[PDB]
A paper describes a structure:
Hexamerin is a 57 kDa protein from the haemolymph of insect larvae and pupae. It forms homohexamers with D3 symmetry. Purified [name] hexamerin at a concentration of 5 mg ml−1 in pH 7.5 buffer containing 30 mM HEPES and 100 mM KCl was used in the experiments. When vitrified on standard holey carbon grids, T. castaneum hexamerin aggregated, rendering most of the particle images useless for single-particle reconstruction. The auto-picking procedure, as implemented in crYOLO, efficiently identified the hexamerin particles. The final structure reached a resolution of 3.1 Å and the surface regions of the cryo-EM map of the hexamer were of sufficient quality to enable model building. The mean shortest distances between automatically boxed particles of hexamerin, which has a diameter of 13 nm, in electron micrographs recorded on standard and ssDNA-coated grids were 16 ± 2 and 40 ± 13 nm, respectively.
Numbering used by the authors:
A (entry chain A), B (entry chain A): 25 to 587, 595 to 685
Write the structure that this text describes.
């Protein structure tokens, strides 16, 4: 049944670094042969491609590091995902998944299987075990994995109820070593929930998936790319303001990269993560000094980065894009932001991928600053080269701020600033907003770390060994804010609440003209107004639209994890405990912007909740609609009756 | 008995990272109290000092990294060594050793115990288990330790004769990552035998031990410092010539350090070794960027290095040393090289330690290029900051070449070049030298790696788990060289054979004037000549005087390890398999210099073989006597009848 399919899906993720020792899994893997049948998949091309990869010494063996930002790794993972996705029936998909689990590389199998599960018509609504639990090596410092393995080695017969079911109290990166100050925001950048958010966003909309083939173009994906990255940057800026940090550092490709990253994580094969030192020179000569290369295109990541940056600048200035036809494509269309997002991201929907390329891929390779692989099968990728650990690197935020500057330039040059009438909602007036005291504190979070040790077959079958990891994760006391609206008739409005800063780290007031980009979508719902006075009450545990529209969320929770506050993986999901940025004992001061507008339903492609169905969104206004473009008159945003600015102090206790 | 004492000493070194689970060890540690007795040690000051360190929160707890190049680590290790050494009877020493094993930090205990054992009157002749087996984390890449721990976790009841007694085939540093080319000589720099040699040399003559208190001044220690480091540098240069490398890179403190080091080792607490990146800036600002410091003197290692280098330059130029009396001390005495060695090294015999200081300590701290410790108990030292891993870093060789340049300057300015009469041995003529074909090849070396995993008490007591590591170590086919001498009367001569290069990496002939420093002491023995023709036959397995005089060696082998080719630890010990530098299939060409001189017995302080007894040496000539100073006429060294130059090709096969 659906419950049994869910349980089997979860079973498939146990002890990924080891072969599946379940009897059914072993039998299925040893007896099944995808190429032998070759008829149960909707397409024979996908199976033929995967067979070509698998047989003729062009496949990533078990035990090798997998990176989705390496070309051949990506090609093989795509082939496996297509094999999983084009299974005519779920039974064939399960047999293929079991075989791949037992035979295909661990990281490659995990990525292909996850993308298939979120994207398959049948298994879209399947919950997935938290990634930080499945593959913990990417989420905890090696001082935690090594301690878990200490307990595992010591747990043998003697000393019962000792070295078992033990809680490892992990610290964040800067506890032991005095790492670079930017890594002081380690409890946020290295939070398992935030990295899970980024990883699940990339699972939902992979940078290599084509919107024509996989229906991701009905979700725009360019506006998604832009809005998701801008919201991540804005939430990071809010956290930095909380901790007294300033705006994210600006960096030049031609100046030594002033920031260094010292990861504390380790690969399951005993290989430590690459380290980027302070003031690292990013030039071909310096970042390939003392290396072989010769036929590695990533060795020249600097020249490719400069080329793609130049091309993006040119297309944004002109507003005219080059296509394979070499013709003139208008970028001023209604969906010009979408075209720009596809162009910059590098997804198969890019106007000309050969010309604009994957700027982010080469930027991550260069800023990761690790040795170029001697061979395909001997690769040493950095944090920036994985989705699960990208947010841990400050260079991640600096790189994507450099990217979003391009979108800001496009909007500034080609978008007309909103006037009073465009934002006006005649007959609606937000009288005042009451928000309960916003308090943020730290609490311990317990996660099943047992997947980081090597279990014996009996232990595997019975899960006898248990080892937890406890981590201080920011949490907030539940709050409920009220919105009072005085309408003129029974209209159907859309309410959009934003969270942004009012004062910078130096206490200076930030004008909306230089502050529109720092606003974080706090809630985005639809309310049916009535003539006269209305009161809108919203709880903290009812907000599912943080920095992202998730309208069909919680119906998947009520089914999969609804058989509380359990890692969803449904849509993207920002941690409910990280919604409010850390405050101060005195209370760092932010402001909430409340907006109300008439309903504009989105062009939903289909009713079924699914990636690419278009059912995600609330309204058809541009994402972050009031602040999606530069603001030329702050007093205009203050004077709108259907708007309201309200100031709150978030209090940190601990 | 002596055998039982040896077995107990070896037992003390099992599973150092874990508490000793032997019943006797636990009983002794829990019942014994060194401060409680306080009378069994020759001095109450040492016990009082160690008690002060141990009780009042100024002691290094178990599980913390220990570095002998940190001031407070060194002070505590010295206190513990003095506690071990001043045990009036061996029984008290054993009780103290057991207690420290069970209670004192692992690295600190290991260092203090080893130094005491080599330096104690009673236990000088005790063999010690190989350091690369006792504390393998400093000798193998973490890809080996993690694999051993994989096997340990998997070895539980099921799968017998599987994951036990397994051989791990380890590779050298550049196998996986394309590390900097200087790390291509990894099979030599990272050889367990060579690093054991350096570590045992530093155990025998620690940089902090006073020659007055511990009789190390009867071994000069300054000439030892110089000659040992010069011979290490020369052997490294021979290896570099074998592999086509050139002279060791010269570096300026004021220019970015062009070489980078990427260690693959990991600390037992799951912390990866520090990495030095290519072209690392060594200035205060750059190597402390983004760090706290504030009361760390090592934070200003650059200024201290410059100061001490300036002082050393000044004293070598003047030949006049500053003392606490501030008076003029002649450096031109017979033992002026000894004074210079004590001055540069920084041992308590230094003429004024406050003024000249420990140049090597700060140089290692700076070139290690790691984060300065946030606290005494949270330290992250580099390879250069341990004796067991110093030779793995190319910066080690560059640093000590920079040091030995000072001694070269002293000798060039203040020593008169030898004439024909000084080197003459009238009546002696080396007719010709025959050396068997010198062949070097690789073979697997098996070492007990079981000490890198965590065993249960029953496994500890029975040593049930066994895991070996196999490594390709250079070995040479046994050879026997003949020396023909035509004497005039029955004299007693000293034979000194040197190994040095004839052609550089570019095929150019090296003149003795620029080649005297590159000669490696191959053998140094005494033969009783007879009137007329003599023939001297020496086997390869009878040479114990490689780059170091060990006359009282092999009598300790015949007793301790003599109850073959087992890691000695007696005196220093260069690996017998690394005596001949790797050749080439065509055969890299070197030359042997054979010298004969009349006997000059050394001023032996005592007959008993022991560190500081002066019994090490063969003759009283200056170490490397023919080549201890610059050569102003190579033809002079060729024309001496009692000398002979012979060319050999060493053939590499494999």
């Amino acid at each position: 049944n659906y419950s049994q399919q869910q349980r089997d899906v979860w079973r498939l993720f146990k002890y990924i670094n080891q072969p599946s020792y379940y009897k059914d899994h072993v039998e299925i893997a040893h007896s099944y042969y995808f190429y032998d049948h070759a008829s149960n998949y909707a397409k024979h091309e996908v199976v033929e491609e995967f067979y070509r990869y698998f047989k003729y010494d062009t496949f990533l063996q078990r035990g090798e590091i997998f990176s989705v930002f390496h070309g051949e790794h990506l090609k093989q993972a795509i082939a496996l995902f297509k094999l999983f996705y084009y299974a005519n029936d779920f039974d064939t998909f399960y047999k293929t998944a079991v075989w791949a689990r037992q035979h295909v590389n661990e990281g490659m199998f995990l990525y292909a299987f996850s993308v298939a599960l979120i994207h398959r018509p049948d298994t879209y609504y399947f919950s997935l075990p938290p990634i930080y639990e499945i593959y913990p090596h990417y989420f905890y410092n090696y001082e935690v994995i090594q301690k878990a393995q200490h307990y595992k080695q010591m747990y043998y017969g003697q000393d019962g109820a000792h070295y078992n079911d033990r809680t490892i109290y992990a610290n964040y990166s800067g506890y032991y070593v005095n790492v670079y100050p930017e890594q002081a925001l380690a409890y946020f950048t290295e939070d398992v929930g935030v990295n899970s958010f980024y990883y699940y966003y990339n699972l939902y909309y992979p940078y290599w998936m084509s919107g024509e083939e996989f229906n991701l173009k009905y979700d725009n994906r360019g506006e998604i790319f832009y809005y998701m990255y801008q919201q991540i940057l804005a939430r990071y800026y809010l956290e930095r303001l909380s901790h007294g940090f300033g705006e994210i550092d600006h960096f030049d490709w031609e100046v030594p990269f002033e920031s260094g990253y010292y990861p504390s994580m380790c690969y399951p094969n005993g290989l430590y993560f690459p380290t980027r030192h302070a003031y690292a020179h990013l030039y071909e000569y310096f970042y390939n000094y003392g290396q072989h290369y010769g036929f590695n295109k990533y060795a020249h990541s600097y020249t490719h980065i400069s080329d793609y940056e130049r091309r993006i600048h040119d297309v944004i200035d002109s507003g005219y894009v080059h296509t394979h036809s070499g013709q003139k494509v208008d970028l001023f269309s209604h969906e010009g932001l979408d075209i720009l997002g596809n162009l910059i991201e590098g997804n198969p929907e890019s106007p000309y991928y050969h010309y604009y390329g994957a700027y982010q891929v080469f930027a991550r390779h260069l800023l990761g600053y690790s040795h170029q692989p001697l061979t395909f099968h001997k690769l040493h990728p950095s944090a920036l080269e994985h989705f699960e650990t990208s947010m841990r690197d400050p260079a991640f935020y600096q790189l994507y701020k450099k990217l979003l500057g391009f979108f800001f330039r496009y909007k500034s040059q080609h978008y007309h600033y909103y006037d009073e009438h465009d934002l006006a909602y005649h007959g609606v007036h937000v009288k005042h907003v009451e928000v309960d005291p916003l308090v943020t504190y730290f609490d311990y979070f317990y996660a099943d770390l047992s997947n980081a040790v090597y279990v014996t077959p009996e232990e595997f079958v019975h899960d006898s060994f248990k080892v937890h990891v406890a981590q201080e994760r920011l949490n907030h006391k539940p709050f409920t804010y009220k919105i009072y609206i005085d309408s003129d008739k029974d209209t159907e409005a859309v309410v959009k609440v934003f969270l942004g800063p009012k004062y910078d780290e130096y206490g200076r007031y930030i004008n909306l003209t230089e502050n529109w980009m720092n606003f974080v979508q706090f809630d985005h719902f639809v309310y049916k107004l009535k003539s006269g006075e209305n009161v809108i009450s919203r709880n903290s545990h009812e907000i599912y639209n943080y920095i992202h529209d998730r309208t069909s969320y919680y119906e998947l929770y009520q089914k999969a994890f609804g058989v509380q506050f359990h890692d969803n993986q449904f849509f993207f999901g920002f941690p409910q405990r990280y919604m409010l940025p850390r405050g101060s004992p005195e209370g760092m001061t932010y402001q909430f912007y409340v907006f109300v507008t008439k309903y504009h339903p989105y062009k939903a492609h289909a009713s079924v909740p699914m990636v690419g169905s278009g059912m995600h969104y609330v309204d058809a206004y541009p994402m972050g609609y009031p602040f999606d473009r530069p603001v030329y008159y702050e007093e205009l945003f203050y004077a709108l009756p259907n708007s309201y600015f309200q100031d709150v102090r978030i209090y940190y206790q601990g």
